[PDB]
Amino acid sequence: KVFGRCELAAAMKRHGLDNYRGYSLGNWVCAAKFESNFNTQATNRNTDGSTDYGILQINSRWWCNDGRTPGSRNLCNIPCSALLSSDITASVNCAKKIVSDGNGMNAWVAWRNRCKGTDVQAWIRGCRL
Ligand SMILES: [Cl-]
Ligand SMILES: [Cl-]
Ligand SMILES: [Cl-]
Ligand SMILES: [Cl-]
Ligand SMILES: [Cl-]
Ligand SMILES: [Cl-]
Ligand SMILES: [Cl-]
Ligand SMILES: [Cl-]
Ligand SMILES: [Cl-]
Ligand code: NA
Q: Where are the domains of the chain?
A: 1-129
Q: CB–CB of 124/33 below 8 Å?
A: no
35 alpha carbon – ligand 2 mean position (Å): 12
| Nearest ligand for residue 65 CA | 10
Selected catalytic residue, list 7, 18, 35, 87: 35
> How far is the CA of 112 from the CAs of 4, 65, 107, in angstroms?
23, 25, 8
Experimental method for this entry? Answer: X-ray
Please give the order of strands across the beta sheet that includes 43-45: 43-45, 51-53, 58-59
> Amino acid identity, residue 32?
A
Q: CB–CB of 117/24 below 8 Å?
A: no
Neighbours of 103 (CB within 10 A): 11
The resolution of the experimental structure, rounded to one decimal in Å, is: 1.9
Fold category of 1-129 in CATH: Lysozyme (1.10.530)
Residue ranges near ligand 10 (ion) with Cβ within 5 Å: 60, 65, 69, 72, 74
